[PDB]
Amino acid sequence: SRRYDSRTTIFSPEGRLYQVEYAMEAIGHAGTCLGILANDGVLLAAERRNIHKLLDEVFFSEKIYKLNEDMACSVAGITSDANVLTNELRLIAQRYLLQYQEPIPCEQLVTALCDIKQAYTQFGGKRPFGVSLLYIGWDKHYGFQLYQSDPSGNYGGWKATCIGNNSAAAVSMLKQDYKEGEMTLKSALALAIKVLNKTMDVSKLSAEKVEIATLTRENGKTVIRVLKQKEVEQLIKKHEEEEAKAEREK
Amino acid sequence: NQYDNDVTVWSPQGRIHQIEYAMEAVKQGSATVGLKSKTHAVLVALKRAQSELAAHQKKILHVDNHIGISIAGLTADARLLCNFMRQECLDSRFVFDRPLPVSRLVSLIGSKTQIPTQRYGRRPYGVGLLIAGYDDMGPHIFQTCPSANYFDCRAMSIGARSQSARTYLERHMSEFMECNLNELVKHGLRALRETLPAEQDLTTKNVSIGIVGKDLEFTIYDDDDVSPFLEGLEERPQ
Amino acid sequence: GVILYGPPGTGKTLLAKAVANQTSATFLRVVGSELIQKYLGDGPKLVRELFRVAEEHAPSIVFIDEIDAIGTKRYDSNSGGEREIQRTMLELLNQLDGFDSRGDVKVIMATNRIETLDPALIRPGRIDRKIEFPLPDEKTKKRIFQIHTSRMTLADDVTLDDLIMAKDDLSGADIKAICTEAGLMALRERRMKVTNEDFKKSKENVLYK
Amino acid sequence: ERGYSFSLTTFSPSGKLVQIEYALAAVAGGAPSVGIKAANGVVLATEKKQKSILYDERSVHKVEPITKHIGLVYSGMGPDYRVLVHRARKLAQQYYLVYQEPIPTAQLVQRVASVMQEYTQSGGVRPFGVSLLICGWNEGRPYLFQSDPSGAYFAWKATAMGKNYVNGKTFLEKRYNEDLELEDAIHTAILTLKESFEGQMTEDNIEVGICNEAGFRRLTPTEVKDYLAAIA
Amino acid sequence: SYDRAITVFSPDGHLFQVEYAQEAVKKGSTAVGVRGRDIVVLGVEKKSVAKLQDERTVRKICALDDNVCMAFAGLTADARIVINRARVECQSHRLTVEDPVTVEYITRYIASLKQRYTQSNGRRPFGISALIVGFDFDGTPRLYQTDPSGTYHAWKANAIGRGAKSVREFLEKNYTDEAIETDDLTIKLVIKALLEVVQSGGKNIELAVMRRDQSLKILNPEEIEKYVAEIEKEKEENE
Amino acid sequence: MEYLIGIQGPDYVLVASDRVAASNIVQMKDDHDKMFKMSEKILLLCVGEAGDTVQFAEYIQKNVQLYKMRNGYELSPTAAANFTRRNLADCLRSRTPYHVNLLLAGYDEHEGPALYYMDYLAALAKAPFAAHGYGAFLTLSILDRYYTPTISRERAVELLRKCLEELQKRFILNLPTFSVRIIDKNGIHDLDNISFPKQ
Amino acid sequence: YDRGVNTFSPEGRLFQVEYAIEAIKLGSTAIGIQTSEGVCLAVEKRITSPLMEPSSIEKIVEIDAHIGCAMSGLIADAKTLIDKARVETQNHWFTYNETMTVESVTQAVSNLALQFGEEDSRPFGVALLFGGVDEKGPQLFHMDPSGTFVQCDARAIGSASEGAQSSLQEVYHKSMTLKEAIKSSLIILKQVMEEKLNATNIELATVQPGQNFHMFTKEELEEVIKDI
Numbered sequence A: 001s002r003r004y005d006s007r008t009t010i011f012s013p014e015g016r017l018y019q020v021e022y023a024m025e026a027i028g029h030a031g032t033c034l035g036i037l038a039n040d041g042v043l044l045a046a047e048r049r050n051i052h053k054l055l056d057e058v059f060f061s062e063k064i065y066k067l068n069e070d071m072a073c074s075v076a077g078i079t080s081d082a083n084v085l086t087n088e089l090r091l092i093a094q095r096y097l098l099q100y101q102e103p104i105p106c107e108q109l110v111t112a113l114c115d116i117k118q119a120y121t122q123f124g125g126k127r128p129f130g131v132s133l134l135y136i137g138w139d140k141h142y143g144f145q146l147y148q149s150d151p152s153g154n155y156g157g158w159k160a161t162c163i164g165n166n167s168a169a170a171v172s173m174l175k176q177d178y179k180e181g182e183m184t185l186k187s188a189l190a191l192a193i194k195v196l197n198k199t200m201d202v203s204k205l206s207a208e209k210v211e212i213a214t215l216t217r218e219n220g221k222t223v224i225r226v227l228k229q230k231e232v233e234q235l236i237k238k239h240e241e242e243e244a245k246a247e248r249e250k
Numbered sequence B: 001n002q003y004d005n006d007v008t009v010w011s012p013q014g015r016i017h018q019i020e021y022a023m024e025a026v027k028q029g030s031a032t033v034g035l036k037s038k039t040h041a042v043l044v045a046l047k048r049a050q051s052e053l054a055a056h057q058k059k060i061l062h063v064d065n066h067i068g069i070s071i072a073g074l075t076a077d078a079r080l081l082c083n084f085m086r087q088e089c090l091d092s093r094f095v096f097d098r099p100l101p102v103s104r105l106v107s108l109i110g111s112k113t114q115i116p117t118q119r120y121g122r123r124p125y126g127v128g129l130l131i132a133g134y135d136d137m138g139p140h141i142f143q144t145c146p147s148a149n150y151f152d153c154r155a156m157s158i159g160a161r162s163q164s165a166r167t168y169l170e171r172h173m174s175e176f177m178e179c180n181l182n183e184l185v186k187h188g189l190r191a192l193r194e195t196l197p198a199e200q201d202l203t204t205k206n207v208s209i210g211i212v213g214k215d216l217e218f219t220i221y222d223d224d225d226v227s228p229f230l231e232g233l234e235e236r237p238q
Numbered sequence C: 001g002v003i004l005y006g007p008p009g010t011g012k013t014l015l016a017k018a019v020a021n022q023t024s025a026t027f028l029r030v031v032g033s034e035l036i037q038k039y040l041g042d043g044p045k046l047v048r049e050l051f052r053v054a055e056e057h058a059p060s061i062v063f064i065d066e067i068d069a070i071g072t073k074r075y076d077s078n079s080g081g082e083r084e085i086q087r088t089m090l091e092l093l094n095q096l097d098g099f100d101s102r103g104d105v106k107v108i109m110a111t112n113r114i115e116t117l118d119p120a121l122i123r124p125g126r127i128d129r130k131i132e133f134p135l136p137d138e139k140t141k142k143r144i145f146q147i148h149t150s151r152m153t154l155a156d157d158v159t160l161d162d163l164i165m166a167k168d169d170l171s172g173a174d175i176k177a178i179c180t181e182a183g184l185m186a187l188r189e190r191r192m193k194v195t196n197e198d199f200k201k202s203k204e205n206v207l208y209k
Numbered sequence D: 001e002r003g004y005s006f007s008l009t010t011f012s013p014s015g016k017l018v019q020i021e022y023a024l025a026a027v028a029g030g031a032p033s034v035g036i037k038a039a040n041g042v043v044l045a046t047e048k049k050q051k052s053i054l055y056d057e058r059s060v061h062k063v064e065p066i067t068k069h070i071g072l073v074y075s076g077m078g079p080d081y082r083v084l085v086h087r088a089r090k091l092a093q094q095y096y097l098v099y100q101e102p103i104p105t106a107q108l109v110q111r112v113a114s115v116m117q118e119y120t121q122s123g124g125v126r127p128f129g130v131s132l133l134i135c136g137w138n139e140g141r142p143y144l145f146q147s148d149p150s151g152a153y154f155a156w157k158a159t160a161m162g163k164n165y166v167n168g169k170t171f172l173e174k175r176y177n178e179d180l181e182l183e184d185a186i187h188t189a190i191l192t193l194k195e196s197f198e199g200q201m202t203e204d205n206i207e208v209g210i211c212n213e214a215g216f217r218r219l220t221p222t223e224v225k226d227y228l229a230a231i232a
Numbered sequence E: 001s002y003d004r005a006i007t008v009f010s011p012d013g014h015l016f017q018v019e020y021a022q023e024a025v026k027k028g029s030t031a032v033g034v035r036g037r038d039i040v041v042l043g044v045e046k047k048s049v050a051k052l053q054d055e056r057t058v059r060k061i062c063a064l065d066d067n068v069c070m071a072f073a074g075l076t077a078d079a080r081i082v083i084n085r086a087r088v089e090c091q092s093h094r095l096t097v098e099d100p101v102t103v104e105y106i107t108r109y110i111a112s113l114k115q116r117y118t119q120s121n122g123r124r125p126f127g128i129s130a131l132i133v134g135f136d137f138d139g140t141p142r143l144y145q146t147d148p149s150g151t152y153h154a155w156k157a158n159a160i161g162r163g164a165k166s167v168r169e170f171l172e173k174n175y176t177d178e179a180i181e182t183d184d185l186t187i188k189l190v191i192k193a194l195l196e197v198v199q200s201g202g203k204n205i206e207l208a209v210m211r212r213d214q215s216l217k218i219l220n221p222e223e224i225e226k227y228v229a230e231i232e233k234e235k236e237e238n239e
Numbered sequence F: 001m002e003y004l005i006g007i008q009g010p011d012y013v014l015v016a017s018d019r020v021a022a023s024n025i026v027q028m029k030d031d032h033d034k035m036f037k038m039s040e041k042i043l044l045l046c047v048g049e050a051g052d053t054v055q056f057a058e059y060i061q062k063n064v065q066l067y068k069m070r071n072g073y074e075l076s077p078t079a080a081a082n083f084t085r086r087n088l089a090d091c092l093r094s095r096t097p098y099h100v101n102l103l104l105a106g107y108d109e110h111e112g113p114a115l116y117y118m119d120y121l122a123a124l125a126k127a128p129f130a131a132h133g134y135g136a137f138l139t140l141s142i143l144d145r146y147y148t149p150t151i152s153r154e155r156a157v158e159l160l161r162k163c164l165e166e167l168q169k170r171f172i173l174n175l176p177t178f179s180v181r182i183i184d185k186n187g188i189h190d191l192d193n194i195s196f197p198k199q
Numbered sequence G: 001y002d003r004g005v006n007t008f009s010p011e012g013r014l015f016q017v018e019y020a021i022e023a024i025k026l027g028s029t030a031i032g033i034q035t036s037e038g039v040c041l042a043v044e045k046r047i048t049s050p051l052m053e054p055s056s057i058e059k060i061v062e063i064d065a066h067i068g069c070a071m072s073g074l075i076a077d078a079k080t081l082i083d084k085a086r087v088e089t090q091n092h093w094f095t096y097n098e099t100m101t102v103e104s105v106t107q108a109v110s111n112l113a114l115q116f117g118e119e120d121s122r123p124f125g126v127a128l129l130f131g132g133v134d135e136k137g138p139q140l141f142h143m144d145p146s147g148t149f150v151q152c153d154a155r156a157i158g159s160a161s162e163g164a165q166s167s168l169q170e171v172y173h174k175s176m177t178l179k180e181a182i183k184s185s186l187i188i189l190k191q192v193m194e195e196k197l198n199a200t201n202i203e204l205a206t207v208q209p210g211q212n213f214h215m216f217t218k219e220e221l222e223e224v225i226k227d228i
C-alpha cells in the first residue's frame, strides 16, 4: 500500500515543492479575469471560453459568483474545483453574520478561505486545488477593496491584476496606463476594453466573448450589476472609434 | 530480493523472511541455559558488559513467586513482554485467587506475539524467553521464539554459541531427573563453560542463577551468593 | 574535476568559450545527447576511444555539454532504453577514474538538472571543483546592458533601468535578445539610432508568448 | 477494513489531470445518445443494441426517471451509471423533505456534479466513466444539462454524447433552430441517431423519453414504432 | 486519516525533510535584527514593491502581544498560521498566570510546536525561521531565533534569509558597545547592515523600532530617506 | 442582590456599580470591582452568582482582545454586545448554563454612545438607562422622573448622586461605596469613587 | 527501494534504530564520572558565533532536586524526554510521598524510547546521562536511542566519545574524591574540543549526598581552570 502512494506533500531536494507549482502552471492557461479600481466602484472583466453556438446562456453569470450581499468573486482554473470553494466561503460569510450580526469585512473572508486552501498543501496526502480567484467588495473600514488568491494559500491586496493566459502582458500594460485615485468608473471601463483587446487573440472583441460586472456603492444597497449584452458593444466600438483617430493622427 | 521487505509478503518458496531475520536477533545475545529435575527448575544466565567499568546487563527477571524468565535479544522488547507477563499473572490472582499455571501463561504469549506477524508494517518481537515455573504438575521449562512458536522441553539453551551447550545437555540428561539442587546447578554450570573461549569462564560477576523449588519461592542469586554454587567445579581439561 | 550548474541561461557554455579563448592547449566539444546511438553498445566504445585519442595528443581539456540530456529524455529511435544508458554512463564514469594512467586530462561540467543525474559521478576524486551559477543581480544587469549596448549607435533615450526590472529574474541572454531585436526593428525602417519605444516593442515581442 | 486515504489523481508536469483525461476516453467509446430541447419539452434519445437475440430488452432501461418531471440518460459504462442514479434519486428526496417542493433541474445538477467532483479528489478511487444528460420542465421553461466525469456542467440547446459525437454536433447545428414542437424534435433525434446505428433501427434498438409540462415520461415501443416509421 | 512517516533518518544520520526545509528559508527575503540597551530595532529588507499593491497586506512584521514583535523568512503561507497559533497561546497565558508573556516563553511554545511537527505522521515540517523580539518585564530587551528543526536560540544581533551569511559576517566586524549608544545610532547600524545586502536603497527596506514601552512604530519612507542620506554622508567624507 | 446603573447621555455613557463582595451574612471585601475592560471604549458590568461572573466575563475579554490582534481594529459596541448574546443562548440549553445578569456600555465613532441590557436569558435591549439588582426597583423611578435626552455630564453625575442617596434610605442592605466610570471619545475615564462615611 | 520504519536487517538488528546511533556522533561531547563522594558531570557548548549569547543554550538540566541530566546528539527532541521525566518524578512523589530512585527514573524514560510506528513515528536521536544521589548513594546511568540503559562509572558521550573513554579508563579508580574528579574531567575536555577552554565554553554540575543538585556558574568555575 506504500508502493502506490504518490506523496503529494513532501518537499523536493532543491527546496521548493512540485505539486502546487504544477497547479499554478495549470492556472496560467484556461481563463482570463481582471479587475480595476481607483474611485467609487470596482469591476471584474472576465473572458468567456466556450463560445459554441449551442448553449442556453443562463444562471446570470459564467465566472462571476455573488458571495455576500456586498461582495463577489471571479474564478479561474478547474471549474469543478471552483464550485466547491464558492459554496464554502459563501457560508463562511453567513456563519460570521450569525455570530456578530454584521456583514463580514472583505479581507478576513479571504484569509479564512486561504487557510482551508493552505491545509491541503501541507498535510493529508491530498490533491490541492488548482484554483486562483479574485475578490471585489466593500466594507465600512476601508471602502472598495481588491484581492487575489493563489493555490499555495497566500493572498494579496492590489489595484489592477490579471490571471489570464497572457496575464504578464496585461500587467505590463496596466502599469503602463494607470492613475492613482483618478480613474473613474468610465475610464476604467474604457481601459478594461483596451486590455482584453490585447490579451484576447480572437480579435474584433465579440461582445458575447467577455463578461463585465460592476460593484457600485448605493447608500444601503452596494449594487452588484452584471451589465447586459446591449451595452457592451457600444463600449466596444467606442474603443474602436478612438483608435482609428489616434493612429491616423500620428 | 523484493520478497524481503515486509512481514505480509510470502516468499515463492513459502518462508517469510522477516520472521527468519528476527531469529538472527536472538542469536546475537549472550547464552543462557535452563533445565529441570523432578522437583526443581534452574536457569543459568551469562551476562555481558561494554567496558570494564560499566556494569553487566542482567537477564533473569522475576515475574511472580513461582515463575521467572530469562531474556535474549533486544532489551526493550523484553520489557514490553515482561510488563505483559506480570499483568497477566496478578489479575488471575485477582480474579480466581490462585497462581496462574505456567502452560496456560505461555499460550497467552503465543497469541500475543502472533498478531504483529500478520499485519502490515508491524515488526515481530525479537526476544528469547526461557520460562521456568510451577504448575500443580511440577517443574516446567518452556522456550519461545519470534515465530510465535513455543516449545515444551526439559533442557534448552539459546543465545550466541548455543549449539555447543546443547551437545553437552544431550549426553548428560539421563542424570538430571535424580539429583538434588546442588549438582543440578553445576550440571548446568558445566554447560556455560562449554560455550566460552578457552581462557575466561566464570569470574563471579557475569553469571546469575535463578531457582524455583518445590518448597522454594523463585530466587535470583547475583555475584556474591553465586560463589557458594560456583565453588566445587573442576578445571577445564586441555 | 570541474563542473557548473544553474538555471537555463546563466553562463556555463559561454564561460567555457572564454576559457578556450585564453587557452594555448588542445580543446574539444561534444554533447552528451548525441552519445546514444540507435544501435547497441557502440556509444560506450565511442567514449572509450574518444578519451583515448584525447589523452594521446597534448595538454588538453575536453568538455561535454548537457550530459543530463542522456539522463532526462528518451528517443524512440534508440534501440533499447536505459539498458544501454546505464552501461554507457557507467563505463564513462569509470573512464575518468581509470586505475591505469589517467594522463594529462582535466574535465569541466555543465548541466541544468544536476540534482537528478546519477550522483555516482559526483564522487570526490572524479569531480573536484564544484561551482554554482546564480541569477545575476540587477546592479550587474546594468553592466550587462552596458555590455550589449556599448558598441551600437543607440539613441540617447536609453534609460536602461526602467527596462531592467521588467522580468524580475531575467537572464544575461535577454539583454542580447532585446538589443538585437531592437536593432532589427531599426533595420526594418533603415533607421540608425535605437529609440526607447523600440525597447518597448522589444520587451513585448521577445517575452510575451 | 479501511481505505487508502491518498489521492491517486495528481497533476502532470504539463498541468493536466491525466485520470480525468482517460475517463473521457471511456465516455467516448460508449453508446451514442442525443438530447434536444425545443420550446415545449426536451427529447432524450439513446441507442440500445443487445449483443444477441437471447437478451431480454424489456429488462433494463437506459432512460431513467428521477422524479415526476426529471429524466436522465448516459453514455459511458454501465455499472457506474446505476450508482449515481440511486444517489440522485436520494438527493431529490432530501430537497423534498425540507422544502415540500419538487426540486428544480438546475439544483439537481448542482448536487450531482458535486458528487462527481468530490469523487475525483478523495482517497483511493478512480473517477466515474459516464457523462449525463438531464432534462426537465420547471416553471414552464424546459432545461437540458450535461455533466462530465470531471464535475463540470453545461446548458445545451442540443448535443450528442457517445461514439461519433463530433459528427452529431455538426448534424444538429445544421438542423436545430429555436422554433420546433416536441414531435418535431423527436423526428430529428431519430434522424441524428440514424447516422451511427446499424441497418435495422427497430422499435427496440432505441429508447426515447420526453418531458412536457405534464411531466417526464418514457415512450412505450408501440408509438416508438410509429415514430420510427415514416422517418429519414 | 493519512498515516505515513514523512521525516525519517538517513543512513548517515540526517533528517532530510528538515534540512530541505532549511533551504526554503535560505531564499526568502532578508530579515535583520539587533538589540539596543533601551530600544530594539529590527527591519526586513526587500519589500519588492511593484507600486500597484496595497502596502499593508504585504507586511512581515506583526505583533503577538503589545510587547512581543516577530519577523520571519521562508514561505509566507506557513508563517501566518504559526503566528495565529501563537496569538492564541499568548492570550491563554493571561487567563492563566496574570502577567503578560515573557519573550522567552513564547519562543519555547513556537519551538516545541515546530519540533513535534517534525515527529508526527503525514506532515512535512515547517519552512520558516523567525526572529522574536521583545522587551519583557523589568525592561530587559532581548531577542531569539527559531530554526525549522525547532532549536530556540538567543542572540545579540542576527540575520536570516537570502544572503544571511554575508550580513552575519558583516555584523561581527561592526558590533561594538558604542554602536548601541543612541537610539538613532543603533538604527544607523541596521541601515548600514541591509545596505550591505541585496540593494534596497531606501526603496525596499522597512525598519520598525520599539522603545520598550511603546508598541511597534514603523517609520515611513521619509526618515529612512533621511537616515540613508546621513549614513552615506559620513561614508562620503571619511573615504 | 447587588446594584449597578446605566445613565447614557448625548456623547457619553455614565456607569457605576457598588464595591461590596458579599458572603453568608458578612462582607468579605469592601472594595471589589465589577468592571471589566475589553477595548479602549467598551466596558462590561456583570452581576450574578459566584463562579459564572468571573469566568464568563473574562472568556469574552479574551475573544475581544483576539479580534483586535487578528484585524488591527476593534469591535463596535453593537457587535461586541451581540457576540455576547450568542454565547449565553448557545450555552443556555446545556449541562451548565451560566447565570449572570449584565449590561454593556460602549462608545463608537460612527453611532456615538450606546448602552445595551441583558439578563440570564440573553435578551438584548438598547436602552437609554438601565439597572440590575434589587436596587433597580427603588431607583428606576427617580431616574425616569428626571431624565432628559439632552443632559450634560455635570448634572448627570449629581443625578446619580441623587439616585444613590435614596438607596441608602429605604433599602435594607448596607452598600456604602460606589465606583464610577465615564466613556467618551477619549476613552475610559475614572471618576471619583463616591461614597458615604459610616463613621 | 523504500522500506518501512519497522524492518529488520538481514543481520537482524533494525534500520532506523541503528541509524539513530550514528546521529549522536554529531553532538557535543559530554563526560560524567561517578565518585563515592558524589557525581560530577560536564559538557562543552560548541559556541558557533561571537554574536551568540552563550548562556541561552544548556546541556545540563535538572530533573528533580537530586537528579541531574546531560544530553547529546540532537537537542530539540531531548526536551520531550526531559518533560516526561519531570512529570514522572512528581507522580511518584504525589502517590508515594517519597523520592523516585535514579534507576527507576531511567526505565520510566527507556520504555518511552522505542514506541514509534504507524498506529495510535521515529526513534529519538539523543543520548542521556542521569546523575543522582538516591538512598544507595551516588548513581550514574546512560541510556540509548535503542532504549538500553546500564549503570556506568565514567561514561563519555558525544562526537569525541571513543577518544575520551580510552583516556578515561586510565585515570579512574574506585577511590576518587570529588575535588580531583572535577579536575580530571576538564583535562579530558581540554584535549577534545576545538576552541580554547574558558569559563564560557563549558559548564558543570555536581550532586552531593549532603546538599541537592548544584550547577556551577561562571564565578566558582574558573578557579578550577586557573588551577588546572
Ligand SMILES: Nc1ncnc2c1ncn2[C@@H]1O[C@H](COP(=O)(O)OP(=O)(O)OP(O)(O)=S)[C@@H](O)[C@H]1O
Pocket (backbone or CB within 6 Å): C006, C007, C008, C009, C010, C011, C012, C013, C014, C015, C066, C110, C112, C136, C144, C147, C171, C172, C173, C174, C176
Ligand atoms: N552573465 C552573463 N554575462 C554576459 N552574457 C551572458 C551572461 N549569461 C548569459 N549571457 C549571454 O547569453 C548566452 C547564454 O550563455 P550560455 O553559456 O549558453 O549559458 P548556459 O547556462 O550554459 O545555457 P544552457 O542552459 O545550456 S541553454 C551567452 O552566450 C551570452 O551571450
Ligand SMILES: [Mg+2]
Pocket (backbone or CB within 6 Å): C009, C012, C013, C014
Ligand atoms: Mg548553454
